Amino acid sequence: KAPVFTVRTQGREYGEFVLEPLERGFGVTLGNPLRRILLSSIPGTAVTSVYIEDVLHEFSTIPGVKEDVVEIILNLKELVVRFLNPSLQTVTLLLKAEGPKEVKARDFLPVADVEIMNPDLHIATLEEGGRLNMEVRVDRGVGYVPAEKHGIKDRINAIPVDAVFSPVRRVAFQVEDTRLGQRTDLDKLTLRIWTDGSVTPLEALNQAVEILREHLTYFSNPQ
């Protein structure tokens, strides 16, 4: 027959999509490829590497700044930016602040067509005489790439940062059983998606389906 697609969205991050009824087996058949696509294909961005002034190693501690360097570096990974035009491929955010102020992700001086979809993300609390002058790289990767795989040495002694590109935080799916009067062994696809807010779940799903279709068009010109 024809399966209906029902959405239960909760804002901009979480959505639960249910497509039913499905022919036997097609539940995982459809649900599983998308899950792979979602966690590794959707184009987002991330912090690839960061340079700080009085910081040499990744495992250092800067007095005046309470939070250890690694802790800050985590929070750098926790932010999500968005590029207005496709032209922007690699952009560098600049940051500078001193004293008993704290730095949030909105303090990064806005560079051209760069939007910060998450401003109040705590970057670092600073004490008296706490000087902090850092800079951050932003590339347009696709998925997750450990720091010790790229480590973009933008400056001379910058620090590699694990690049968490994939907009989806996580994607989980299940195939329950549904009936159609005659038969009860009909697959029921329930697919839940968790994002960082860069893109709503439905948009991401749209992305997945498109990506799969374009791939299905590759089996057309034999040689």
Partner: protein
């Protein structure tokens, strides 16, 4: 038995429950009440966790 009858049959239970009885009934937890799910096949399907209760393999 057409679709109508089956759909009706789902409308006749909903919250209703049935009692499932073990071969040798020993202790209190030897008979439980479960909500019936219209499953194909011909054997009674029983939940994993309630086995060791009335000792069923």
């Amino acid at each position: 038995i057409k679709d109508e009858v089956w759909d009706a049959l789902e409308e006749v239970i909903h919250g209703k429950v049935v009692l499932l009885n073990r071969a040798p009934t020993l202790h209190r937890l030897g008979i439980q009440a479960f909500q019936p799910v219209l499953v194909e096949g011909q054997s009674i399907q029983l939940h994993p966790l309630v086995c060791e209760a009335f000792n069923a393999d």
